[PDB]
Design a binder for these strands. Structure first.
Lengths: 203, 193
RNA sequence: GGCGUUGCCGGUCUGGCAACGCC
RNA sequence: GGCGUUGCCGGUCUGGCAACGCC
């Protein structure tokens, strides 16, 4: 049924979430919010709740909560970035989204927006925490949506057996520059695993 | 012989085309002419000609005696200085950017000079950040052999054996894994063979 | 408090401990 | 011609090809 709304007025759950998020936002004003898995395992762990996600979206739809890909924020929370930095975060999200399977390098991005590495790192790290970007290595960050789409492609490729670097590159219409770091990242988070000199998809 | 005339021809040809290379790679001089001739005897052929003062022999390249690369006098000095910094720093070599900063060099000029030393065999590229002097790497491989003789070793134990730090040792070990000197098994290494 | 750099440690990661810079 | 950069290639660089800059 996916679950809509229930009756048990133990809204002391929402009270405990507000407390935790308020506490998190005053401590971490330059973070997007509390990790959804952290809120999961701190207040809704022992209760075998698959409805925790349905609960999150309900409060979201009420306008009580901002849901990012892996962080949750009280509605009304704004990180304490400068207005220039707030605009940059939007502009970085867009550039990485549009570039997709051919993301710009850290150095290209720093030059483009005329930022020092220190500030760029801080901004990208924010987007990584939020789940908009995923760090493949120190040079390459990928938009979440782009990465999910690359993984779908690779999963279908690997359904017929181990694949090489060239075969992944052909399936993604990409280049070795982009694909080797991607595949090394996918080994690290255990999406892929090396078999001989090729890879298969595990989980 | 013969052979020598073919060699002088080959090297004069190489030097005039590549006046900013240290010389022709030894295994190219071999596969090009003395490929039917075995590995041994070819070594003795080069060392014989080197004792006669006819060839300059480097770790991986050969040059006719008298050949000087067409670097500027400033660059020639730099190359001596670079070789020295790396030799003395040994198992804690400077990073590429550290060296670019201390010698006040554009990355492309530093690259040109390190590439020459790496071609010649004086330096070995461990990774983008770290070059090692040849002698430093040779001695470190000896330490690694000693360590491995008692059994498979961890990163911490190799750092102990080199009196070093993890920052320097891990890149060394990853390099030695890529050239198949060592092999990694879980969090241990052995020396292959 | 936070954000970052560096060093060392522990196989390794926005990891632990410490210096420093910044807010 | 070379040196470098970037791109692409072949699992990889003591590379190959192409464009650009410099000589």
């Amino acid at each position: 049924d996916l679950y809509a709304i229930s009756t048990e007025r133990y809204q002391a759950w929402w009270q405990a979430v507000t407390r935790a998020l308020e506490e998190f936002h005053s401590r971490y004003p330059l973070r997007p919010g509390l990790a959804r898995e952290e809120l999961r395992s701190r207040y809704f762990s022992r209760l075998p709740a698959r409805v925790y996600q349905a609960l999150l979206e309900e409060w979201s739809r009420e306008g009580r909560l901002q849901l990012a890909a892996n962080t949750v924020a009280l509605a009304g929370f704004t990180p304490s970035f400068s207005e220039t930095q707030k605009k940059l975060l939007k502009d970085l999200e867009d550039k990485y989204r549009v570039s997709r399977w051919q993301p710009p390098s850290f150095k290209e991005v720093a030059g483009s927006f005329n930022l020092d590495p220190s500030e760029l790192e801080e901004l990208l790290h924010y987007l990584v925490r939020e789940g908009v970007l995923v760090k493949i290595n120190d040079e390459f960050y990928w938009h979440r949506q782009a990465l999910g789409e690359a993984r779908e492609v690779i999963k279908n490729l690997a359904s017929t057996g181990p694949f090489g670097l060239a075969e992944a590159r052909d399936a993604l219409g990409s280049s070795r520059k982009y694909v080797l770091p991607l595949l090394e990242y996918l080994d690290q988070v255990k999406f892929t695993r090396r078999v001989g000199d090729k890879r298969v998809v595990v989980g």
